Amino acid sequence: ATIHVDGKEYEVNGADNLLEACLSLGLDIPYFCWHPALGSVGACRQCAVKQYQNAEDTRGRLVMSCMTPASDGTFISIDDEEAKQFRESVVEWLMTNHPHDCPVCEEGGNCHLQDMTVMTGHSFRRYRFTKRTHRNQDLGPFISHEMNRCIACYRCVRYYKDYAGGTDLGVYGAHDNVYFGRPEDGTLESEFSGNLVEICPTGVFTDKTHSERYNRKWDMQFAPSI
Amino acid sequence: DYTLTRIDPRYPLQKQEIVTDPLNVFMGKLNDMVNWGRKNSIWPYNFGLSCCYVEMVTSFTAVHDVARFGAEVLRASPRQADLMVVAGTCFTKMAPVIQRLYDQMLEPKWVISMGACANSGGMYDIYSVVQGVDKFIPVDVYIPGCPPRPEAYMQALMLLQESIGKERRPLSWVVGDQGVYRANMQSERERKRGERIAVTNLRTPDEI
Amino acid sequence: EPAWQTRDHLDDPVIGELRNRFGPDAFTVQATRTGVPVVWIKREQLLEVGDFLKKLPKPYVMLFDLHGMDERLRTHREGLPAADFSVFYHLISIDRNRDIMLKVALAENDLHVPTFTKLFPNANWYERETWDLFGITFDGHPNLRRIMMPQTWKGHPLRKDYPARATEFSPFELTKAKQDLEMEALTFKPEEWGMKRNEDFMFLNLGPNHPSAHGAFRIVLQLDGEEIVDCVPDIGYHHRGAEKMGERQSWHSYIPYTDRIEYLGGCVNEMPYVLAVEKLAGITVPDRVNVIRVMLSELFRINSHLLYISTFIQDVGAMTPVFFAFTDRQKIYDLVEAITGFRMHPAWFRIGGVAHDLPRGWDRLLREFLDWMPKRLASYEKAALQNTILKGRSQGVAAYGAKEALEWGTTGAGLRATGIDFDVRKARPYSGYENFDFEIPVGGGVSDCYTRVMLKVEELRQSLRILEQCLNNMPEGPFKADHPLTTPPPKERTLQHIETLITHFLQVSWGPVMPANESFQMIEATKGINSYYLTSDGSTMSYRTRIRTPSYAHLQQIPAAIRGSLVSDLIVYLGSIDFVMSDVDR
Amino acid sequence: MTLKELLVGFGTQVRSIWMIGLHAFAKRETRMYPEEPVYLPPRYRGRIVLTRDPDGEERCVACNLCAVACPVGCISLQKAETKDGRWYPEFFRINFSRCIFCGLCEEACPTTAIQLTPDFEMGEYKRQDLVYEKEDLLISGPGKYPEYNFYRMAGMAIDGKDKGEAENEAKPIDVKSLLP
Numbered sequence A: 001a002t003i004h005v006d007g008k009e010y011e012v013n014g015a016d017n018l019l020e021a022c023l024s025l026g027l028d029i030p031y032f033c034w035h036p037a038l039g040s041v042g043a044c045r046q047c048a049v050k051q052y053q054n055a056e057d058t059r060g061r062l063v064m065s066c067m068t069p070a071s072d073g074t075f076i077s078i079d080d081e082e083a084k085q086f087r088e089s090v091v092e093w094l095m096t097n098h099p100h101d102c103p104v105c106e107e108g109g110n111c112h113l114q115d116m117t118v119m120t121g122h123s124f125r126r127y128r129f130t131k132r133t134h135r136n137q138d139l140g141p142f143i144s145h146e147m148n149r150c151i152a153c154y155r156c157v158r159y160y161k162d163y164a165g166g167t168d169l170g171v172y173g174a175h176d177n178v179y180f181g182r183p184e185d186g187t188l189e190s191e192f193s194g195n196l197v198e199i200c201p202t203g204v205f206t207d208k209t210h211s212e213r214y215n216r217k218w219d220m221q222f223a224p225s226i
Numbered sequence B: 001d002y003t004l005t006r007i008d009p010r011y012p013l014q015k016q017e018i019v020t021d022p023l024n025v026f027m028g029k030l031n032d033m034v035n036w037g038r039k040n041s042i043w044p045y046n047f048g049l050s051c052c053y054v055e056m057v058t059s060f061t062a063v064h065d066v067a068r069f070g071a072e073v074l075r076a077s078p079r080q081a082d083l084m085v086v087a088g089t090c091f092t093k094m095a096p097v098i099q100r101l102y103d104q105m106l107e108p109k110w111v112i113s114m115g116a117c118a119n120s121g122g123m124y125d126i127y128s129v130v131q132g133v134d135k136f137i138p139v140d141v142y143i144p145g146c147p148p149r150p151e152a153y154m155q156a157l158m159l160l161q162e163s164i165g166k167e168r169r170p171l172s173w174v175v176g177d178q179g180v181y182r183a184n185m186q187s188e189r190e191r192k193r194g195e196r197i198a199v200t201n202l203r204t205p206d207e208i
Numbered sequence C: 001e002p003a004w005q006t007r008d009h010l011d012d013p014v015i016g017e018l019r020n021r022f023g024p025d026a027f028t029v030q031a032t033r034t035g036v037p038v039v040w041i042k043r044e045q046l047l048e049v050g051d052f053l054k055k056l057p058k059p060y061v062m063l064f065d066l067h068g069m070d071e072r073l074r075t076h077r078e079g080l081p082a083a084d085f086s087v088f089y090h091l092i093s094i095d096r097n098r099d100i101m102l103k104v105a106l107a108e109n110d111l112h113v114p115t116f117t118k119l120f121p122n123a124n125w126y127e128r129e130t131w132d133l134f135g136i137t138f139d140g141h142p143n144l145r146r147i148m149m150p151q152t153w154k155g156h157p158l159r160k161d162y163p164a165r166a167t168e169f170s171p172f173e174l175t176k177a178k179q180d181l182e183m184e185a186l187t188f189k190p191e192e193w194g195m196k197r198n199e200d201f202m203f204l205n206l207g208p209n210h211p212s213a214h215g216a217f218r219i220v221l222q223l224d225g226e227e228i229v230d231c232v233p234d235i236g237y238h239h240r241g242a243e244k245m246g247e248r249q250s251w252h253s254y255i256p257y258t259d260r261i262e263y264l265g266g267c268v269n270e271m272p273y274v275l276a277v278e279k280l281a282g283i284t285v286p287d288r289v290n291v292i293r294v295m296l297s298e299l300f301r302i303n304s305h306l307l308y309i310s311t312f313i314q315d316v317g318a319m320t321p322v323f324f325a326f327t328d329r330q331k332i333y334d335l336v337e338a339i340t341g342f343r344m345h346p347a348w349f350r351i352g353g354v355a356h357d358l359p360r361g362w363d364r365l366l367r368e369f370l371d372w373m374p375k376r377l378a379s380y381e382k383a384a385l386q387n388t389i390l391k392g393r394s395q396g397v398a399a400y401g402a403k404e405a406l407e408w409g410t411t412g413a414g415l416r417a418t419g420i421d422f423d424v425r426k427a428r429p430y431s432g433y434e435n436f437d438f439e440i441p442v443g444g445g446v447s448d449c450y451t452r453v454m455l456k457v458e459e460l461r462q463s464l465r466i467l468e469q470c471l472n473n474m475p476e477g478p479f480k481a482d483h484p485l486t487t488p489p490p491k492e493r494t495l496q497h498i499e500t501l502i503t504h505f506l507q508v509s510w511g512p513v514m515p516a517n518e519s520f521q522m523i524e525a526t527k528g529i530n531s532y533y534l535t536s537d538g539s540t541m542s543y544r545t546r547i548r549t550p551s552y553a554h555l556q557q558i559p560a561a562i563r564g565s566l567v568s569d570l571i572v573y574l575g576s577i578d579f580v581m582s583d584v585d586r
Numbered sequence D: 001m002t003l004k005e006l007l008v009g010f011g012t013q014v015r016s017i018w019m020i021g022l023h024a025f026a027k028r029e030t031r032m033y034p035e036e037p038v039y040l041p042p043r044y045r046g047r048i049v050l051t052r053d054p055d056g057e058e059r060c061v062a063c064n065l066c067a068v069a070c071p072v073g074c075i076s077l078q079k080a081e082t083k084d085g086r087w088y089p090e091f092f093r094i095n096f097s098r099c100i101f102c103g104l105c106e107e108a109c110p111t112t113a114i115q116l117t118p119d120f121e122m123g124e125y126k127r128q129d130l131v132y133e134k135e136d137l138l139i140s141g142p143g144k145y146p147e148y149n150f151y152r153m154a155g156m157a158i159d160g161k162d163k164g165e166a167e168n169e170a171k172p173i174d175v176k177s178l179l180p
């Protein structure tokens, strides 16, 4: 399959979607709700690009790269002004209800939402109204819960229910009061519930065992081990 | 509350041991007179290394007037100098030169590290910098700063004077004990912790 | 089109001339944000291209810079020839007011280039440094020895596989054998330095301990009686590894290291680095930022010139103007402490602006300094600078013309005392210097010590005029740009907005992400032309930081100008250059 | 040499002597440290302290931004948590023999806890005594920022501040609420 990103030709796999194909080529498209192991759902509306019908097209249309197949002879633009403005607007909408929590958050410096806020170029706040809040739940000894930081990307429920097969985590509520967690306070029963600390792009699910003696990612001495 | 040092030529070539203060009342008065004369006339070696030397010669100028302490003669020869101010970075090419100049100085001699470079290497944790001048020569006073302001150099001069004024050295090289006794004085951090912790309000940085 | 845009500069007439002379396939034109035409020339055509540029109708007469780059770790090398290492040559034509950057690609095994010294004599020290730090051999060099590190040093420090920090190495142990071995290495031998020695040529040692404010360094002198028949400066005693730290610190955290490049310059040293990083980031700073940075640059320029004039007068033999000039420096320091919070290394410029706004009451202190300075300057002239003993010590001592200044890369007052009107603030204006009315003083054609000192007095007066214009016209507006890459963001929005807090959090911890590009900024420093050449590989750290300083050129010009003079003439020439050893070694 | 040159030089030497004499008849420019205290501007970059909130608690949330923004790397700290859930430094040490007093840590602090105060008198006899622990840095007041509190801005719930009690925050709405 042949795609044209910003006037440059690329050879990709036609069975892949545009987001994973463009990330495999080294291009940067912001995304929240898509995971390679979980598939595409088109929820966060962050991976928007501008697709053109043919080569001699100027208008185009905003499509979602996770929901669009990378078929042969595709014409898309990432650095288009309208696509960049829409991605910055999506980051801004996610940032309207976000708590001022980065210094006291275990995801700080390891946060996908921080990286995508910086990548979209959104650094000026003009929202002046209140932010929604959520109470937290006790999820056991391993996972720490902080629902104020959620961006409603549905990664946790998709992984935990579709992939891991767990039963006790779900999404509850409505329009902007979506809650992600257990129906009641208790320990998460899945044997693979600890992957929520890497699945969640925010600091809603955090490593409590690490949060006891917490240090940032840049301060860690890492090794490859078994 | 004293340390005993004797030298006999890795650097530094000295061994120190914690010893009780030995201190006739005439010998004591002679010792205080010698210490007073040594501390009220301290001739620094005019040694230029880096920007900290620019601050040191700023301290020597008219708006600061380090001459008031009797520390202005500023000898160009290490034989005539009492104090070595390492005012700058200890570069690896300059470190044997510093060691040679310190060896060419004569007793009694004192060392002031001026700046973060001379203290520990400072911001220059790099291949061509010795991480502090205390790696190879013994230091009496340390000044944090990059650079210290000239009055910080004067404050270290006062600290050195107070350290000299209660140290014991032989009056003559034929009579007495020839080891050098230095006072184990209270650290300035623990002394100023009482007046530093109690600070509550400071002027806001939006004004002059 | 903004001034930071990526340009290939194919409209430059030098590109068309090179196309007509060497052919279209002979070289590759690279589009950069440096503002200069970058041409990748093949190695065997390098001397031909140098001769062609030297014999143009408006020739490229000055080798501005010559250094190397390790391209092994560089991932974003799109549109570039294949290379493990590279050597770049920055050449300036003053008549065209243009400049060109030639680049020679080298493989890892064949690290040899033909030498450039037959065209430009400053290539001697530039190629010695390139060999010292990168291991690139230059065939035909008169003496290719190390110039920064000692001769008994293993490895080349600026290679990417060389560990940067001292804590990586063993801690410094000074034993008796080590002290003897390093004292043996610093001993001078006539044959190794290319002295080329009559039964009367004695040898003189000047340093390395130096009783002056401008660093510590050595000069070895060949003497016939009192006449200097030959001399070669020994430098590297003040090497701080600032470029390796440029590869080791992030974009924001490197600014204190940019401060200590020329430690009498301060914000003047901060200016080209932040300008080049803003070119990399695509940031156009507002006008208030430009006026603030011009004001602080001129304040530190007056500070440096005051120290230089005082040190020159002290080296002549009058010891009172150093006291009064340091009092004037204390007045400048009062204003600088009020604005930035520090005296000599403020580290106050930022990517996108300045660290804080101007404090309330800065105009008052600037008024006191502007009222204080000119009477003190006139007293300095009447007391010491018009003294006939000082004139006899200074006039006609170590004099050179326009050709010797051009061939050695001398800039600043030494170049402009030869009659060449070339200031960066008027030829290639930066940071809104085109909005200020000031004059560029020039000499008659001969660069004496006295002519350079009087020229620096004239630039002190012109900087006072620029400071008066800054005081009268300072715009009301932001002290930081509204770009997303302004590092750090404005503090109050960081303290109450989550997106601004995220931007600040990632910019001060991991660093700001400059996209992969090359940028260049040259400014008129307090001692000449200071330039930053910054190569970014798309990361939060600089891939390459090249700092060109004029003191390197002036210390290299010393043996050509002091030859056949006295030792006291050498002392006066050292006092009248306006150098520092941090600028030389860095 | 010329006789006119000799006379002009003699007159210039006399003029220099005269000017230095009138400079002797001038006012002393010396600031008499230490009897005259040294004036410092409020934003002077001297001794580093950790400050407290107006409520009296220490402002540092142990977020390690100052340690990573330090170009020397002379700040070391460890996060600890109280039972209510607030973050604080378990310890906090600054190697002042390494610190270049550049103010980058204060610029990077999102709680205005770490500050550089107008104090330069920091001389020491031993280099081990230049390592200032949290006992030597935490002062009794707010310092240069008298009213800023980070925990009034944060979304995390601590003692005396539950969910929705922060600035620009609404009360939490349960998913079981009857309102649409």
Ligand SMILES: CCCCCCCCCCCCCCCCCC(=O)OC[C@H](COP(=O)(O)OCCN)OC(=O)CCCCCCCCCCCCCCCCC
Pocket (backbone or CB within 6 Å): C386, D006, D007, D008, D009, D010, D011, D012, D014, D015
């Ligand atoms: C071994 C030594 C042999 C030589 C000396 C023999 C004994 C002295 C014989 C008389 C000397 C007269 C000298 C000439 C006086 C008039 C000209 C003059 O002053 O020239 C010097 C200088 C010229 O000006 P210029 O350098 O061009 O600066 C630009 C400003 N127009 O103008 C100036 O600098 C300004 C005016 C300065 C005037 C200075 C005083 C002149 C008279 C001195 C008399 C004796 C004083 C003795 C000391 C008294 C104080 C302690």
Ligand code: SF4
Pocket (backbone or CB within 6 Å): A098, A099, A100, A101, A102, A105, A106, A107, A108, A109, A111, A112, A113, A114, A149, A201, A202, A203, A204, C502
């Ligand atoms: S989840 Fe990310 S953006 Fe939200 S408070 Fe934590 S670090 Fe900040």
Ligand code: SF4
Pocket (backbone or CB within 6 Å): A149, A150, A151, A152, A153, A154, A155, A156, A157, A180, A199, A200, A201, A202, A204, A205
């Ligand atoms: S809790 Fe995390 S993974 Fe789940 S929807 Fe919210 S942001 Fe996504």
Ligand code: SF4
Pocket (backbone or CB within 6 Å): B050, B051, B052, B053, B087, B088, B089, B114, B115, B116, B117, B118, B122, B145, B146, B147, B148, C260, C263
């Ligand atoms: S401590 Fe700072 S001011 Fe002093 S020599 Fe080092 S770099 Fe210069």
Ligand code: SF4
Pocket (backbone or CB within 6 Å): D048, D066, D069, D070, D071, D072, D073, D074, D075, D094, D098, D099, D100, D101, D102, D103, D104, D105, D106
């Ligand atoms: S002032 Fe600079 S060197 Fe000192 S602790 Fe803060 S960031 Fe580090």
Ligand code: SF4
Pocket (backbone or CB within 6 Å): A103, D059, D060, D061, D062, D063, D064, D065, D066, D067, D077, D105, D108, D109, D110, D111, D112, D113, D114
């Ligand atoms: S940046 Fe401020 S709040 Fe964060 S660890 Fe440092 S002093 Fe504490």
Ligand code: FES
Pocket (backbone or CB within 6 Å): A019, A030, A031, A032, A033, A034, A041, A042, A043, A044, A045, A046, A047, A048, A064, A065, A066, A067
């Ligand atoms: S990643 Fe495509 S819409 Fe979320």
